[PDB]
Amino acid sequence: GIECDSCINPSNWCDGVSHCPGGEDENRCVRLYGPNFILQVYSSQRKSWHPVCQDDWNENYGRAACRDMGYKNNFYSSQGIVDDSGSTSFMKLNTSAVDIYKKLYHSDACSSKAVVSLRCIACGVNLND
Amino acid sequence: IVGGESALPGAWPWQVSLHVQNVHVCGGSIITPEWIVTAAHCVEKPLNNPWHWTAFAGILRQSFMFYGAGYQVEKVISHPNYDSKTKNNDIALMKLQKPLTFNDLVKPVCLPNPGMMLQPEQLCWISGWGATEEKGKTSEVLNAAKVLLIETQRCNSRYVYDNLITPAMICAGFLQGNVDSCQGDSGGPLVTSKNNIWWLIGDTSWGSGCAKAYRPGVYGNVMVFTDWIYRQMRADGEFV
Numbered sequence: 001g002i003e004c005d006s007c008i009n010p011s012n013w014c015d016g017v018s019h020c021p022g023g024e025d026e027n028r029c030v031r032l033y034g035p036n037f038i039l040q041v042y043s044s045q046r047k048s049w050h051p052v053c054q055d056d057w058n059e060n061y062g063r064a065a066c067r068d069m070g071y072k073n074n075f076y077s078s079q080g081i082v083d084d085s086g087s088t089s090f091m092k093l094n095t096s097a098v099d100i101y102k103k104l105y106h107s108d109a110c111s112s113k114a115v116v117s118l119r120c121i122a123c124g125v126n127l128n129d
Numbered sequence: 130i131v132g133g134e135s136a137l138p139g140a141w142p143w144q145v146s147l148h149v150q151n152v153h154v155c156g157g158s159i160i161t162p163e164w165i166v167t168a169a170h171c172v173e174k175p176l177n178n179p180w181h182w183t184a185f186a187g188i189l190r191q192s193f194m195f196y197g198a199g200y201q202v203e204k205v206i207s208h209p210n211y212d213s214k215t216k217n218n219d220i221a222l223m224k225l226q227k228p229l230t231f232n233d234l235v236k237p238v239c240l241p242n243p244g245m246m247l248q249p250e251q252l253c254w255i256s257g258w259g260a261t262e263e264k265g266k267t268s269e270v271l272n273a274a275k276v277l278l279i280e281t282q283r284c285n286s287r288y289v290y291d292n293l294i295t296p297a298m299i300c301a302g303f304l305q306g307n308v309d310s311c312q313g314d315s316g317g318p319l320v321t322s323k324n325n326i327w328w329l330i331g332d333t334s335w336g337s338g339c340a341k342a343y344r345p346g347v348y349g350n351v352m353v354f355t356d357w358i359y360r361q362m363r364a365d366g367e368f369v
């Protein structure tokens with residue numbers, strides 16, 4: 001069970017339906033992982049985070065993932081990269097579809113062989129390098 | 130900052146000076162054009178109201194923060210689990226009335242992601258206008274210094290901080306001292322470079338004295354706070 005500053009059943013965490021009075025179970029379902037900003041989504045069935053495949057991903061999907069993460073209208077970059085998060089399962093996009101995390105399905109591979117690297121804001125750059 | 134050096138323009142473009150009554154009080158870190166990460170103890174009552182606060186960006190010298198260069202703060206949000214006694218969960222957010230304009234002098238620092246795989250003694254940087262000596266005055270020029278991460282197990286030793294470092298805290302500095310944050314640096318950034326990107330890993334929170342041996346700096350563990358930060362930012366985006 002996961003608590004939302006009250007715990008909820010795990011299959012109802014990030015299942016598209018709010019169950020916590022404040023909605024904490026449905027508002028932290030997208031996340032950037034590692035120093036390469038690998039886009040990850042929480043799978044309620046597997047109770048784990050999984051990278052998003054580059055297959056059929058576009059800018060407007062990234063912008064919506066950036067909106068879900070709290071970056072509003074901020075968008076910097078999105079490209080496919082080789083997964084370095086050591087994952088074995090992935091979330092592949094179904095086009096026949098709806099919130100970002102409710103549009104994906106479990107896949108053990110990605111056709112493109114790439115995962116989404118998403119940057120919502122141009123940060124972390126100073127004078128050097 | 131004790132033991133540091135004066136910062137160059139654009140060296141720390143996310144650093145802001147937070148003012149109350151025309152006087153620097155705390156540091157903060159830009160993460161978006163609207164949002165600043167600072168420390169919750171900076172905004173304890175009576176300074177919890179946003180109208181007291183002005184933020185100055187892209188200016189290195191306190192005497193150069195003229196009337197009209199500041200950005201008026203619109204919202205102050207302390208972490209709901211902040212504890213004044215222990216400084217646990219010492220983080221707060223500040224939203225500006227008008228968004229910053231980003232350029233070579235004013236840019237955000239990146240929020241940390243899970244899976245950064247930092248080294249146990251990762252090389253880090255701190256910056257601010259805090260005193261350059263314990264019990265000293267606010268510094269006129271922005272300073273910065275290199276500090277190493279100190280593993281919490283070592284920091285919680287009987288001879289360092291004796292189990293006072295909670296999972297919402299990290300230690301950085303040198304057990305010999307001589308390089309440390311100090312009064313007026315609190316709320317400011319603890320950043321590290323990885324994958325050619327600067328990440329905000331800590332916000333300057335507290336410590337016993339400044340630059341004293343076996344009393345390093347304690348920083349709010351920004352990684353633990355990212356979920357709360359995202360929720361606040363998304364909730365504000367949906368208007369209030």
Ligand SMILES: *C(=O)c1ccc(NC(=N)N)cc1
Pocket residue numbers: 259309310311312313314315316333334335336337338339340341344345346347
């Ligand atoms: C904040 O103003 C602040 C943070 C930390 C210290 N002490 C040490 N870093 N030892 C003083 C003041």
Ligand SMILES: [Ca+2]
Pocket residue numbers: 012013014015016017018019020025026
């Ligand atoms: Ca739910």
